[PDB]
């Protein structure tokens, strides 16, 4: 009678987490529908033929979390390396330590500042706004690093990445970056961090490995939901695609940013001597450059070639794949509307919304996985197992 117990739209970390938990902990059959030719969403990786180096096809993916439960969960499917992510910043022909630390300060200001002297210097340069009263990105950034540093490393980068007035961008975007007064130049500040030892695709394939999970690549949910759902009428639907696209943009177009990549194999062994180099100056079109050999130093790749990737940012069109939610005031207002329509869809046909795209949220991998675990624990499992309504 009932073919599946649950439909999941999208095979990203949210979708796979949901699909894995349901199938493995509740002994239920889950159908996962993926539009792309591969699973894993933007986390999908692929070895470059010439060099053998693993390439994060949709931009650099670095896993990190302070959530012990998430860390323990993800380690069920993959090992993690010793890698600690660091970023350098290119400004006026000089490579700077990054982000905010004694390294960045001493370089940019020409002399060594003690932790105490550094705190005083920034406090002076952050006088025009206090951190608590920070409404947007521009105000919050200046309140944390000061206007001179904001001018040189934030204002330009933010322009290329968003093409939106920094006074209209959320403050949460800039607070993704740690603000320190030590020489610690770790780009993240979570307890647990590392790269998947055998790569991202292996990790992802292990999450969807269970026999009760079926994944259909090259399949849009909208093309087949008419045919599928009557086959399993009681089965709920977890949707992780673009939230506005789901309702045919009937309330308006949410602001998204999309990315274009240029992948190039170079006849030299080392291009920039580090994994990610940010480009903060507007005299260059790309936001940053990835050199993927530096992601996995524990592996010994060939030393005569190397793979680099330039990252370009622009507004997402109707045919584009959305990467970043812009989340301006207008966007947040429009989101509130779709939230209501999504809330209605949950009660009318048991359709759930989650993930970066499904919630218009600037989510990372760990945040997406944690979110999926919460939806499983508090919503999905009680429904599928104990009959409880989804609301």
Ligand X SMILES: Cc1cc2nc3c(=O)[nH]c(=O)nc-3n(C[C@H](O)[C@H](O)[C@H](O)COP(=O)(O)OP(=O)(O)OC[C@H]3O[C@@H](n4cnc5c(N)ncnc54)[C@H](O)[C@@H]3O)c2cc1C
Ligand Y SMILES: O=c1ccn([C@@H]2O[C@H](COP(=O)(O)OP(=O)(O)O[C@H]3O[C@@H]([C@H](O)CO)C(F)(F)C3(F)F)[C@@H](O)[C@H]2O)c(=O)[nH]1
Catalytic residues: 176, 180, 257, 288, 311, 362, 364
Q: Is the dihedral of CA 265, 270, 275, 281 positive or negative?
A: negative
User: Given the complex with ligand Y, which of 48 and 291 has the nearer CB atom?
Assistant: 291
Phi, then psi, of 16 in degrees rounded to 5: -70, -40
Q: Is the dihedral of CA 342, 346, 350, 352 positive or negative?
A: positive
Q: Is 183 in the site for a second copy (CB under 8 A)?
A: yes
Task: Please say whether the beta carbons of 76 and 231 come within 8 A.
Answer: no
Total of residues contacting ligand Y (CB under 6 A): 20
Known binding residue 84? Answer is no
109 binds, among ligand X, ligand Y, a second copy, none (CB under 5 to 8 A by kind): none
Task: Please say whether the beta carbons of 151 and 159 come within 8 A.
Answer: no
3-state secondary structure of 106: helix
List the x/- string, 78-117, binding to a second copy by CB under 8 A: ------x-x-x-x--xxx-x---xxx--xx--xxx-xxx-
Q: Is 170 in the site for ligand X (CB under 6 A)?
A: no
The DSSP symbol for 373 reads H
3-state secondary structure of 36: coil
Known binding residue 324? Answer is yes
Q: Is 230 in the site for a second copy (CB under 8 A)?
A: no
Q: Which of 122, 144, 177, 237: binder of ligand Y (CB under 6 A)?
A: 177
CA neighbours closer than 13 Å in the CB half-sphere of residue 268: 6
Q: How many CB atoms lie within 10 A of CB 223?
A: 11
3-state secondary structure of 296: coil
89 binds, among a second copy, ligand X, ligand Y, none (CB under 5 to 8 A by kind): ligand Y
Q: Which residue pairs, CB below 8 angstroms and at least 24 apart, start in 293-296?
A: 293/51, 293/53, 295/54, 295/56, 295/60, 295/83, 295/195, 296/53, 296/54, 296/81, 296/83, 296/195
The DSSP symbol for 107 reads H
Known binding residue 278? Answer is yes
Task: Please say whether the beta carbons of 357 and 319 come within 8 A.
Answer: no
Q: Is 35 in the site for ligand X (CB under 6 A)?
A: yes
Q: Is 87 in the site for ligand Y (CB under 6 A)?
A: yes
Choose the binding region for ligand X from 127-135, 278-286, 301-309, 351-359 (rule: CB under 6 A).
Answer: 351-359
Nearest to 355 by CA among 340, 343, 372: 372
List the x/- string, 273-312, binding to a second copy by CB under 8 A: xx-------------------x--x---------------
- Report the nearest approach of ligand Y to the CB of residue 93 (Å): 16
Known binding residue 21? Answer is no
Cα angle 304, 305, 310 (rounded to 5 degrees) comes to 150
Q: 87 to each of 2, 90, 286, 299, how far by Cα in Å?
A: 51, 10, 15, 20
User: Given the complex with ligand X, which of 28 and 366 has the nearer CB atom?
Assistant: 366
Q: Which of 154, 195, 326, 375: binder of ligand Y (CB under 6 A)?
A: 154
Interruption sites in the chain after residues (C→N beyond 2.5 Å): none
Q: Is 43 in the site for ligand X (CB under 6 A)?
A: yes
Scan for tokens 């675990």, then name that residue. Answer: 373
Q: Which of 97, 161, 346, 359: binder of ligand Y (CB under 6 A)?
A: 161
d(CA 41, CA 196): 16
The terminus-to-terminus CA distance of the chain in angstroms comes to 26
171 binds, among a second copy, ligand X, ligand Y, none (CB under 5 to 8 A by kind): none
User: Given the complex with ligand X, which of 269 and 297 has the nearer CB atom?
Assistant: 297
Known binding residue 34? Answer is yes
User: Which chain residues interact with ligand X by CB under 6 A?
Assistant: 9-10, 12-15, 33-36, 41-43, 59-63, 220-222, 240-241, 259, 323, 355-357, 363-366, 368
Annotated binding site: 14, 34, 42, 62, 153, 158, 162, 187, 220-221, 278, 288, 324, 356, 362-365
User: Which chain residues interact with a second copy by CB under 8 A?
Assistant: 84, 86, 88, 90, 93-95, 97, 101-103, 106-107, 110-112, 114-116, 118, 181-184, 268-274, 294, 297
Annotated binding site for FAD: 14, 34, 42, 62, 220-221, 356, 363-365
């Amino acid at each position: 009678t009932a073919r599946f117990d649950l439909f999941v739209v999208g095979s990203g970390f949210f979708g796979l987490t949901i699909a894995e938990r349901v199938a493995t902990q509740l002994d239920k059959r889950v159908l996962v529908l993926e539009r792309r030719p591969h699973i894993g969403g933007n986390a999908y990786s692929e070895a470059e033929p010439q060099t053998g180096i693993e390439v994060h096809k949709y931009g650099a993916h670095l896993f990190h979390t302070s959530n012990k439960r998430v860390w323990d969960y993800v380690r069920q499917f993959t090992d993690f390396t010793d890698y600690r992510h660091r970023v350098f910043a290119m400004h006026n022909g000089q490579a700077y330590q990054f982000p905010m630390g004694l390294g960045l300060v001493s370089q940019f200001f020409g002399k060594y500042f003690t932790p105490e002297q550094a705190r005083q210097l920034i406090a002076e340069q952050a006088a025009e706004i206090d951190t608590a009263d920070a409404q947007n990105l521009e105000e919050k950034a200046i309140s944390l690093i000061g206007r001179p540093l904001y001018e040189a490393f934030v204002k330009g980068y933010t322009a290329k990445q968003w093409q939106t007035d920094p006074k209209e961008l959320p403050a949460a975007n800039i607070t993704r970056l740690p603000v320190r007064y030590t020489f610690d130049n770790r780009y993240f500040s979570d307890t647990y961090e590392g790269l998947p030892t055998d790569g991202y695709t292996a990790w992802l394939q292990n999450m969807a490995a269970d026999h009760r999970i079926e994944v259909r690549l090259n399949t849009d949910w909208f093309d087949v939901r008419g045919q599928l759902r009557p086959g399993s009428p009681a089965a709920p639907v977890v949707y992780t695609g673009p939230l506005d696209r789901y309702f045919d943009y009937a309330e308006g177009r949410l602001g998204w940013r999309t990315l274009d990549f240029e992948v190039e194999v170079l006849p030299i062994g080392d291009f920039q001597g580090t994994a990610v180099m940010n480009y903060n100056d507007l005299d260059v079109p790309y936001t940053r450059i990835h050199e993927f050999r530096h992601f996995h130093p524990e592996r010994d790749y060939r030393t005569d070639k190397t793979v680099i990737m330039r990252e370009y940012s622009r507004f997402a069109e109707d045919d584009d794949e959305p990467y970043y939610p812009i989340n301006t005031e207008a966007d947040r207002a429009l989101l509130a509307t779709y939230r209501a329509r999504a809330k209605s869809e949950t009660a009318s046909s048991k359709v759930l919304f989650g993930g970066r795209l499904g919630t218009y949220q600037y989510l990372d991998m760990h945040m997406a996985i944690a979110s999926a675990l919460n939806m499983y624990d508090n919503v999905l499992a009680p429904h599928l197992r104990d009959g409880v309504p989804l609301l």
